[PDB]
Amino acid sequence: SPFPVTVREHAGTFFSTTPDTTVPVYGNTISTPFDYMCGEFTDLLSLCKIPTFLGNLDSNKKRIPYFSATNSTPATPLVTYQVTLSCSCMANSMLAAVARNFNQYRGSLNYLFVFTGSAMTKGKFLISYTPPGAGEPKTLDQAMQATYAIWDLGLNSSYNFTVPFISPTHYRQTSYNTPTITSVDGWLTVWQLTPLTYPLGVPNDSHILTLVSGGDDFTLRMPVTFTKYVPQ
Amino acid sequence: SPFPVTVREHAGTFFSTTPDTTVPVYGNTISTPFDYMCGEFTDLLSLCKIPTFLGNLDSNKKRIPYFSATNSTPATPLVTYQVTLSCSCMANSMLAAVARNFNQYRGSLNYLFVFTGSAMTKGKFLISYTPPGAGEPKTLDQAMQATYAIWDLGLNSSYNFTVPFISPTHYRQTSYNTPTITSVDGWLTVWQLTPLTYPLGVPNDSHILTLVSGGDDFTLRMPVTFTKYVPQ
Amino acid sequence: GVDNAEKGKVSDDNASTDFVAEPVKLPENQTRVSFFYDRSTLSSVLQSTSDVSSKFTPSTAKNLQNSILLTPLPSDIVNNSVLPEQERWISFASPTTQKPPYKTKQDWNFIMFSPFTYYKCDLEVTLSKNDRETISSVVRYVPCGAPSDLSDQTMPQTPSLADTRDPHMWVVGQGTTNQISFVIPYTSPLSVLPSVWFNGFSNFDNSSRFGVAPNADFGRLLLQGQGTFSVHYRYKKMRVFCPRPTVFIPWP
Amino acid sequence: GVDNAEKGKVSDDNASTDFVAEPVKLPENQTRVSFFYDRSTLSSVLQSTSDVSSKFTPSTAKNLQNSILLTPLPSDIVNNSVLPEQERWISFASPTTQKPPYKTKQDWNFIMFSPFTYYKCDLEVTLSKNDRETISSVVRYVPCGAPSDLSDQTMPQTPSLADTRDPHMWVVGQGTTNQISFVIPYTSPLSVLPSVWFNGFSNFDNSSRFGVAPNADFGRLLLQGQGTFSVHYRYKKMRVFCPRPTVFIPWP
Amino acid sequence: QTMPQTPSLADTRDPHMWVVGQGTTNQISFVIPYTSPLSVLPSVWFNGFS
Amino acid sequence: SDRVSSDTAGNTATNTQSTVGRLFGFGQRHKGKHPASCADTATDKVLAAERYYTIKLASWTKTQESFDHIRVPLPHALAGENGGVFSSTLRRHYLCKCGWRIQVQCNASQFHAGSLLVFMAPEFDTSNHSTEVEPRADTAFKVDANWQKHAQILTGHAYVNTTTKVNVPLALNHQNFWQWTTYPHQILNLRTNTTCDLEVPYVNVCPTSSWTQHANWTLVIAVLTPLQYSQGSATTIEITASIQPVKPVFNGLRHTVV
Amino acid sequence: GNEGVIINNYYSNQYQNSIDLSAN
Amino acid sequence: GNEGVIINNYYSNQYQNSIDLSAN
Amino acid sequence: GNEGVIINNYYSNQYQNSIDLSAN
Amino acid sequence: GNEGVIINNYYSNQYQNSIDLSAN
């Protein structure tokens, strides 16, 4: 006999994210075999962990994947990156590209620096991560009072620096209208501890490539659409 | 094959209190961990049992959390509270605040009195609960003919008085348009048995704090919305 | 019997303590927090004058926006904000009357009765069209703190709100029943939400509006299509923490 | 600590490597490719001005055809093609504004975020009428690369699109809810589809439009009946291969 | 009304129903439990005052 | 008798001879566990910070009425120089998580009358209400210098000018003091005790606090019954408090705040 | 609270409800 | 991914979904 | 009385019907 | 006669059909 039904108040509604399927109109069809394929990946996090380039500003305000250093120790940081997946600095990194499609993140961030100067060039940098609350570090004295690692040049070319996940909340926002304590987490500044030093016949300026990616315990969640824009 | 259905006469109706759920549009989402939290409570009754302040009238018709007593024994009660969770007297107590959102109650009521006079002040009060039927008690002779307890001042500062649940019905209304035998249950009056007595150098007036709450076997039921009002 | 309130707590007695009586307790559980709040209450109203196939544009008309901030607490356009933000106080809609309606949106039942400092729950939202004219609307749900994406249409004659991967609903036709309902999970980056006040600022230069917590909501609802729609909230798996005072009521 | 990026890969560290810290990993799986793409996103729009009982005839009106090419990539009439073909670039609809809408059809969310070279999946299509007027439409689904069959009616007053064994849908009446949804299997003769670019030609005399792969779609949708309909795509059992760059975003 | 253009009857936690649209069938039905504080209700007369 | 109680904390110790016991808010204590929201290993078990910090609060006179009160924002009340090592460590850390062990003191005599309500409240508005000005970093978390009246908070206090106030019936910083007794508390009844002992765990909207922006806990002393005494009795009646941060844990070491 | 249906929920528990998890 | 229904699919797996097959 | 359905009630017995209880 | 449904009748047999009874 027919079953009595109570039509809910949302009849006919199309839920773009309902966790259910719809009617198949061309079933019993074989999906063209692709067993020969390679390169498949199943988690978008894989992408977030691939170190990608940061956009630094050239002397002519042009965007370049590195910063310069020479035979001197500035009283100010060579570069300053605000730790937000919203930083214009990492706007075109795979990390940010993926994060733009998610609401929150959690975990470590890896800032990879690759020294491209000559083999004869030496020097030491102090990479610091300053948590918020007391503002951006104004001096080396302040920067070294927070989380930091000293990078010494030599045989190995790069330094993998991790910005520890230090937050009042378990998750942090990927973007924001105005900075809040849940969307902005401090700064990463790299200072010149000792001047880049070298012999004669070597260009005064050395270029350090800069990249970012999510660390080992980095995660993103809540799929969303980012603010649309016109390509150019 | 498709199932025959009989669409009930209430199709499309939105039942605000249907005991069923609706469609999830963003599932497989983790609720931000909060295991570190404390202070959680699961029953609103917990609140009803917390003794909260009664609003007594000041000589200038101002509302105060206590009443006065001195070296004399008035022929009339110092205070009179009609036992109704609707009493203007307990209007701002947590008990009444919660009860306003429920239809009926049942069980004991606790009226807590705290003597705030000096340590040198002594005295005895007769707290009486008069069930209805013969009207409010006009004299001490009448008051002591109903349920009562004699409160003697001393080392212990407060007296926890219980208004027994005496009713023709198992449950009683929380509010009413006009008083009925199921919404009004008598009066609680506190009399001065012996005058407050004290030595020289002590202020003549002593203040007794007054509070209410549901007793050990107190319960409320049937969630409802109280008569709205404009805050001020 | 005697006791000492200064201790911070006194016993919960019944008639048997002082008198010749018996406990009279009867089982009851309609006072449980989860049960009490697990029911739909009017909490907001929405209005749109633009069609489905058009670009969504934030608008206000007699105190009604075409988007909503999902929170039981008072919300409204604050200091010319693009979209509704959480308010810190309630105001009358009329500058004269000194009587409601209020210009701010909220679950009156929640505001008038929220004897706790923090709360945790999922949100069941119900959206209903205020008249019987056949519905034709598109609603976009944006998780707590996520981008609003108030962009242009990328294709002609399409509802811009549907141009997203965000959860969105589309109801239209004479077969429908002019309403929409769904449930969303708690999405705030906060562990628990402040139910009344937040004694602090939301930014590092402490310039925000003191009293409002950062990202203390369940997201937002943007709507396009003709009509005025009322909104209900139902608190699923409701959990509350730290008992606190209820809104004061004028002395009778 | 130190490393050498020239190797082609460096370790994924957490705070414990260089400092006195602990891993802080929490389980999460909303980043899985299958889950991420398993949701409906606006991907196309369709428009028809001819009735159901008539002969279907390819038409364009202000950049809207009455047929669609099922592919998340940009598609549109290319060099006066009879039906929409896959494009190689996106153009603004307006010759002046320099602002969207675009004249080309696509899943903006897919184009803006497709960090892979190839993909495999089934397609859940949703078709919605842009207004509340009672629907009366017939849609014909044509498998990838199959004959379009834009023939005359074989019988008077019948929808020519329904005159086929191809999967077709017919919705009409006040009992309906002005929409259609269904899922089709991957039908391309290719094992996997190119998600962005195809570095080659599709014919043996290499005269085709370089950059477009042969039969890289899920078929087409032809529609007849009055109205404008928006289309959504939902990628079922989505699988992706070979990571690649995302669309560049202007520097803030 | 506490908010403009909203049904005041729905502005409650009390059980309420809302039906509207051409998909509906112009009726409402539901069942409520006995809620009186009385054990049993008088079917005809009540020989007394309230 | 059994009312003599001593409590040690680091190099400090409180003593009372009229205690009515210690009340544990929510029946919980801060155990000092590190916040799971921080990867850096927290700095904790700092003996020099796990002690009682004693400060004078206010003078109680006959002019105070029921519900007039004094507020003590936490941890801010101790973020100054007098906060010792708790302060100096706090100022150099982004986050702090802790509970509170408190004893408020106030003696009079067997001939004085009156009572106070001593309680701890989370998310209790500590902003200035004697103005329509927006609360700022240096005016929102300060220990009250004067007794606060009660009328202006029943329905809250909007930071808007007096004429607008008319169309604003309720503000979210409202405090129905008639129910202030629902907060973990104790009563200081002059005839009974001269001290109140409370302790509350850590509660907040998140695992640990960015204290520079938030004073999650507030110690409040409100009069319940006005002070009374006859000619000849001591007229100076003062209120004091010993505040101890319970097992504070710090994360996000950085340069100090100014 | 207000769960009065005999048959199990049609949607998974992980989808119908927010997933509760302890960070410790 | 986004499969949160308790009861099994009403349509066969071979009809609801494309049939995956290996050519080797 | 007038209970002629084979399959059990969709709503719990405690919700579909008033809960009968004895005070003794 | 014309009873071709697999699943049992939703309504009780005593309600769906007239109750046949013998007076002897």
Author numbering:
A (entry chain B), B (entry chain B): 1 to 232
C (entry chain A), D (entry chain A): 1 to 82, 89 to 188, 191 to 260
E (entry chain A): 159 to 188, 191 to 210
F (entry chain C): 11 to 268
G (entry chain D), H (entry chain D), I (entry chain D), J (entry chain D): 15 to 38
What do the study authors state?
Human Saffold virus 3 (SAFV-3) belongs to the species Theilovirus in the genus Cardiovirus of the family Picornaviridae. SAFVs cause diseases ranging from gastrointestinal disorders to meningitis. Cardioviruses have nonenveloped virions with an external diameter of about 30 nm. The major capsid proteins VP1 to VP3 form the capsid shell with pseudo-T=3 icosahedral symmetry whereas VP4 subunits are attached to the inner surface of the capsid.
